[PDB]
Amino acid sequence: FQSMSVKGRIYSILKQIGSGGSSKVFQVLNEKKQIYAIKYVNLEEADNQTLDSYRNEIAYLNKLQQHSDKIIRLYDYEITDQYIYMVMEYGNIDLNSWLKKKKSIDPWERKSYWKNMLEAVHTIHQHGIVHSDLKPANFLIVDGMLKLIDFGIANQMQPDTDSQVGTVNYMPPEAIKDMISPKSDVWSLGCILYYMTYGKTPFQQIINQISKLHAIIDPNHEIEFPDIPEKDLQDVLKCCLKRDPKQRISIPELLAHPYVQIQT
Ligand SMILES: c1nc2c(NC3CCCCC3)nc(Nc3ccc(N4CCOCC4)cc3)nc2[nH]1
């Protein structure tokens, strides 16, 4: 039966959607019984660099929403030396949970979601952000439209009440080779669309974690692309999962691709 105040306005808490490390997100109602999601971040043990990172996420998100409506709407925020309250729009469900429940995705809906994702990541790229660690969980379904909730800075968020994929599965090869590019996100997006298309991520079948990394980077490992009705889609997946960034398709190319632009 808890409640919370953000910028002079009081919000009753219905339940906790999920928590990741030093942050929590709640389903809340306002004064006029309108629904929102409020993110609470605890800064008490957050280091100087970590504070600066959270500052950046708010700053960008605050600006970016004015450009595109495929980035989560932040209606209001409150920020102090010990806490952050972010009042965002409420979404029905994160994509990762939705994808776990949907054993088969509708080809039309997949295609729509893909266009929603592309528009979102295109917008962050245009403002000089490479998300780098892109996941399905970074996308939120609000009224049949995917929206980008998280910019990948210092996130550990899971829902808080089977778990097939690992953390590494969507990661680019260059990031593993690193020990950079907008096209690094294109690889990650590619894996999301690949999961939606074939039911698993490209390297899910690999048992061992050590070798799974080595498998991603290795050019002599070939990825499966079983034939499907949409020969467009099959091209997009291949084009996204080409290991070399220079050859790998760019976001603007993906937008003018037939899959996105051609009606069937
Ligand atoms: C801004 N930020 C938001 C969310 N963040 C969540 C943070 C934890 C991981 C999932 C996303 N969830 C939102 N909605 C959800 C509603 C129900 C959800 N669940 C239903 C399925 O089982 C898991 C919880 C998950 C997210 N809305 C939202 N607006």
Coordinates of C-alpha atoms and ligand atoms in Angstrom, one line a residue:
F1 CA 0.0 0.0 0.0
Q2 CA 3.0 2.3 -0.6
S3 CA 3.0 5.7 -2.4
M4 CA 5.6 8.1 -3.7
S5 CA 6.1 11.8 -4.6
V6 CA 7.8 13.1 -7.7
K7 CA 8.0 16.9 -8.4
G8 CA 5.0 17.9 -6.2
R9 CA 2.8 15.1 -7.6
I10 CA 1.8 11.9 -5.7
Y11 CA 1.7 8.4 -7.2
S12 CA 0.2 5.3 -5.6
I13 CA 2.2 2.2 -6.3
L14 CA 0.2 -0.8 -7.6
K15 CA 3.1 -3.3 -8.0
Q16 CA 6.8 -3.7 -8.8
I17 CA 7.3 -4.5 -12.5
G18 CA 11.0 -5.5 -12.0
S19 CA 14.4 -4.7 -10.5
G20 CA 18.0 -4.7 -11.6
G21 CA 20.8 -4.0 -9.2
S22 CA 20.5 -0.5 -7.6
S23 CA 17.2 0.4 -9.5
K24 CA 13.6 -0.6 -9.4
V25 CA 10.5 0.1 -11.6
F26 CA 6.9 0.3 -10.4
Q27 CA 3.5 0.3 -11.9
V28 CA 1.9 3.5 -10.5
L29 CA -1.3 5.5 -10.6
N30 CA -1.4 9.3 -10.3
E31 CA -3.9 11.7 -8.7
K32 CA -6.4 11.2 -11.6
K33 CA -6.0 7.4 -11.7
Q34 CA -3.8 7.5 -14.9
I35 CA -1.2 4.7 -15.2
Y36 CA 2.6 5.3 -15.4
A37 CA 5.8 3.5 -14.8
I38 CA 8.2 5.0 -12.3
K39 CA 11.9 4.1 -12.2
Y40 CA 13.6 4.5 -8.8
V41 CA 17.4 4.4 -8.8
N42 CA 19.3 4.3 -5.5
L43 CA 22.5 6.3 -5.6
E44 CA 23.8 5.8 -2.0
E45 CA 26.6 3.4 -3.1
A46 CA 26.8 4.7 -6.7
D47 CA 30.3 5.9 -7.6
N48 CA 31.1 9.2 -9.3
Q49 CA 31.4 7.7 -12.8
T50 CA 28.2 5.7 -12.2
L51 CA 26.3 8.9 -11.2
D52 CA 27.6 10.6 -14.4
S53 CA 26.4 7.7 -16.5
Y54 CA 22.8 7.9 -15.0
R55 CA 22.9 11.7 -15.6
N56 CA 23.7 11.0 -19.2
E57 CA 20.9 8.5 -19.7
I58 CA 18.3 11.0 -18.4
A59 CA 19.8 13.9 -20.4
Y60 CA 19.7 12.0 -23.7
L61 CA 16.3 10.4 -23.1
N62 CA 15.0 13.9 -22.2
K63 CA 16.1 15.3 -25.6
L64 CA 15.5 12.2 -27.8
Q65 CA 11.8 11.8 -27.1
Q66 CA 11.1 15.1 -28.8
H67 CA 12.5 13.7 -32.1
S68 CA 10.9 10.2 -32.2
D69 CA 7.9 8.6 -30.6
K70 CA 9.7 5.2 -30.7
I71 CA 11.8 6.2 -27.7
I72 CA 10.0 5.8 -24.4
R73 CA 8.3 9.0 -23.2
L74 CA 9.7 10.5 -20.0
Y75 CA 7.0 12.8 -18.6
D76 CA 8.8 14.0 -15.5
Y77 CA 11.9 13.3 -13.4
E78 CA 13.3 14.2 -10.0
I79 CA 17.0 13.9 -9.2
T80 CA 18.9 14.3 -5.9
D81 CA 22.2 13.3 -4.2
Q82 CA 20.6 10.0 -3.1
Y83 CA 17.8 9.0 -5.5
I84 CA 16.4 9.3 -9.1
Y85 CA 12.7 9.2 -9.8
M86 CA 11.8 8.9 -13.5
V87 CA 8.1 9.1 -14.5
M88 CA 7.8 7.2 -17.9
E89 CA 4.8 6.1 -19.9
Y90 CA 3.5 2.6 -19.0
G91 CA 4.0 -0.3 -21.4
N92 CA 2.1 -3.5 -21.6
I93 CA 5.2 -5.8 -21.6
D94 CA 8.9 -5.9 -22.5
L95 CA 9.7 -7.7 -25.8
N96 CA 11.8 -10.5 -24.2
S97 CA 8.9 -11.7 -22.0
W98 CA 6.5 -11.4 -24.9
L99 CA 8.9 -13.4 -27.1
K100 CA 9.2 -16.1 -24.5
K101 CA 5.4 -16.5 -24.4
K102 CA 4.9 -16.4 -28.2
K103 CA 6.0 -19.8 -29.6
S104 CA 5.0 -18.4 -33.0
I105 CA 5.1 -14.7 -34.0
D106 CA 2.7 -13.3 -36.7
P107 CA 4.7 -12.4 -39.9
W108 CA 2.9 -9.0 -40.2
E109 CA 3.5 -8.1 -36.5
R110 CA 7.2 -9.2 -36.7
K111 CA 7.7 -6.9 -39.7
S112 CA 6.0 -4.0 -37.9
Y113 CA 8.1 -4.4 -34.8
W114 CA 11.2 -4.6 -37.0
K115 CA 10.3 -1.2 -38.5
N116 CA 9.7 0.2 -34.9
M117 CA 13.1 -1.0 -33.7
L118 CA 14.9 0.4 -36.8
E119 CA 13.4 3.8 -36.3
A120 CA 14.3 3.9 -32.6
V121 CA 18.0 2.8 -33.1
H122 CA 18.3 5.1 -36.2
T123 CA 17.3 8.1 -33.9
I124 CA 19.9 7.3 -31.2
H125 CA 22.6 6.9 -33.9
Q126 CA 21.7 10.3 -35.3
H127 CA 22.5 11.9 -31.9
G128 CA 25.8 10.0 -31.5
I129 CA 24.9 7.0 -29.4
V130 CA 25.9 3.4 -30.1
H131 CA 23.9 1.3 -27.7
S132 CA 26.4 -1.6 -28.1
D133 CA 24.7 -4.2 -25.8
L134 CA 21.3 -4.3 -27.5
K135 CA 18.7 -6.9 -26.2
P136 CA 15.0 -7.6 -26.7
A137 CA 14.5 -6.5 -23.1
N138 CA 15.6 -3.0 -24.2
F139 CA 12.3 -2.7 -26.2
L140 CA 8.9 -2.2 -24.7
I141 CA 5.5 -2.8 -26.4
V142 CA 3.2 0.2 -25.8
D143 CA -0.1 -0.1 -27.6
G144 CA 1.3 -2.5 -30.4
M145 CA 4.3 -0.3 -31.0
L146 CA 7.8 -1.1 -29.8
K147 CA 9.7 1.6 -27.8
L148 CA 13.3 1.9 -26.7
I149 CA 13.3 2.0 -22.8
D150 CA 17.0 1.6 -22.1
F151 CA 20.1 3.1 -23.6
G152 CA 22.5 0.3 -22.4
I153 CA 24.6 2.3 -20.0
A154 CA 24.4 0.5 -16.6
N155 CA 21.3 -1.8 -16.8
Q156 CA 20.6 -5.1 -15.0
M157 CA 16.8 -5.0 -15.3
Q158 CA 14.7 -8.2 -15.1
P159 CA 11.0 -8.6 -14.4
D160 CA 10.2 -9.5 -10.7
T161 CA 7.4 -12.0 -9.8
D162 CA 12.4 -21.0 -19.5
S163 CA 15.3 -18.4 -19.6
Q164 CA 16.7 -20.0 -22.7
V165 CA 19.2 -17.4 -23.9
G166 CA 22.4 -16.2 -22.2
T167 CA 23.6 -12.6 -21.8
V168 CA 26.2 -13.0 -24.6
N169 CA 23.8 -14.3 -27.4
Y170 CA 23.0 -10.9 -29.0
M171 CA 26.6 -9.5 -28.7
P172 CA 28.6 -8.4 -31.8
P173 CA 31.8 -10.2 -32.9
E174 CA 33.9 -7.0 -32.9
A175 CA 33.0 -6.4 -29.2
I176 CA 34.4 -9.9 -28.4
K177 CA 37.4 -9.2 -30.8
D178 CA 37.9 -5.8 -29.0
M179 CA 40.0 -7.5 -26.2
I180 CA 32.6 0.9 -31.6
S181 CA 30.4 1.3 -34.8
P182 CA 26.7 2.0 -35.3
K183 CA 26.7 -1.3 -37.4
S184 CA 27.5 -3.1 -34.1
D185 CA 23.9 -2.4 -33.1
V186 CA 22.7 -3.7 -36.5
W187 CA 24.2 -7.1 -35.6
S188 CA 22.3 -7.1 -32.3
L189 CA 19.0 -6.0 -33.9
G190 CA 19.6 -8.8 -36.5
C191 CA 19.7 -11.4 -33.7
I192 CA 16.4 -10.1 -32.3
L193 CA 14.7 -10.4 -35.8
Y194 CA 16.5 -13.8 -36.2
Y195 CA 14.9 -14.9 -32.9
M196 CA 11.5 -13.7 -34.0
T197 CA 12.0 -15.5 -37.4
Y198 CA 13.4 -18.9 -36.4
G199 CA 12.5 -19.1 -32.6
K200 CA 16.1 -19.0 -31.3
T201 CA 19.2 -16.7 -31.4
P202 CA 22.0 -17.6 -33.9
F203 CA 24.3 -19.2 -31.3
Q204 CA 21.7 -20.5 -28.8
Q205 CA 22.4 -24.1 -29.8
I206 CA 26.0 -23.9 -28.4
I207 CA 26.2 -25.6 -25.1
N208 CA 29.6 -24.3 -23.7
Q209 CA 30.0 -20.6 -22.9
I210 CA 33.8 -20.4 -23.5
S211 CA 33.6 -21.6 -27.1
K212 CA 30.3 -19.7 -27.9
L213 CA 32.3 -16.5 -28.0
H214 CA 35.0 -18.1 -30.2
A215 CA 32.1 -19.3 -32.4
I216 CA 30.7 -15.8 -33.0
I217 CA 34.1 -14.2 -34.0
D218 CA 35.3 -17.2 -36.2
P219 CA 34.6 -16.6 -39.9
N220 CA 34.7 -20.3 -40.7
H221 CA 31.5 -20.9 -38.6
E222 CA 28.4 -20.5 -40.8
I223 CA 25.0 -19.4 -39.5
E224 CA 21.8 -21.3 -40.5
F225 CA 19.1 -19.4 -42.5
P226 CA 16.4 -22.1 -43.3
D227 CA 14.2 -21.1 -46.3
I228 CA 11.0 -19.2 -45.5
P229 CA 8.1 -17.5 -47.4
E230 CA 9.7 -14.0 -47.0
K231 CA 12.8 -14.1 -49.1
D232 CA 13.1 -10.4 -48.2
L233 CA 13.4 -11.3 -44.5
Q234 CA 16.0 -14.0 -45.2
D235 CA 18.1 -11.3 -46.9
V236 CA 17.8 -8.9 -44.0
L237 CA 19.0 -11.6 -41.5
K238 CA 22.0 -12.5 -43.6
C239 CA 22.8 -8.8 -44.3
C240 CA 22.6 -8.0 -40.6
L241 CA 24.7 -11.0 -39.4
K242 CA 27.7 -10.5 -41.8
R243 CA 30.6 -10.5 -39.4
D244 CA 32.7 -7.8 -41.1
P245 CA 31.2 -4.4 -40.1
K246 CA 32.3 -2.6 -43.3
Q247 CA 30.3 -5.0 -45.5
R248 CA 27.4 -5.4 -43.0
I249 CA 24.3 -3.4 -43.9
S250 CA 23.7 0.1 -42.4
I251 CA 20.5 1.2 -40.7
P252 CA 19.5 3.6 -43.6
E253 CA 20.1 0.7 -46.1
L254 CA 17.8 -1.5 -43.9
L255 CA 15.1 1.2 -44.0
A256 CA 15.1 1.4 -47.8
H257 CA 15.3 -2.5 -48.0
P258 CA 12.2 -4.2 -49.5
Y259 CA 11.2 -6.1 -46.3
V260 CA 10.6 -2.7 -44.7
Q261 CA 9.3 -0.9 -47.8
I262 CA 7.4 -3.5 -49.8
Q263 CA 3.8 -4.6 -49.0
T264 CA 2.5 -8.2 -48.9
Ligands
LIG1 C1 8.9 2.2 -18.6 N1 9.7 1.2 -18.3 C2 8.9 0.1 -18.2 C3 9.1 -1.3 -17.9 N2 10.4 -1.7 -17.5 C4 10.7 -3.1 -17.3 C5 11.9 -3.3 -16.4 C6 12.1 -4.7 -16.0 C7 12.3 -5.6 -17.3 C8 11.1 -5.4 -18.2 C9 10.8 -4.0 -18.5 N3 8.1 -2.1 -18.0 C10 6.9 -1.7 -18.4 N4 5.9 -2.6 -18.5 C11 5.9 -4.0 -18.1 C12 4.7 -4.5 -17.8 C13 4.6 -5.9 -17.4 C14 5.7 -6.7 -17.5 N5 5.6 -8.1 -17.1 C15 4.6 -8.9 -17.7 C16 5.2 -10.3 -18.1 O1 5.9 -10.8 -16.9 C17 6.9 -10.0 -16.5 C18 6.4 -8.6 -16.1 C19 6.9 -6.1 -17.9 C20 7.0 -4.8 -18.2 N6 6.6 -0.4 -18.7 C21 7.6 0.4 -18.6 N7 7.6 1.8 -18.8

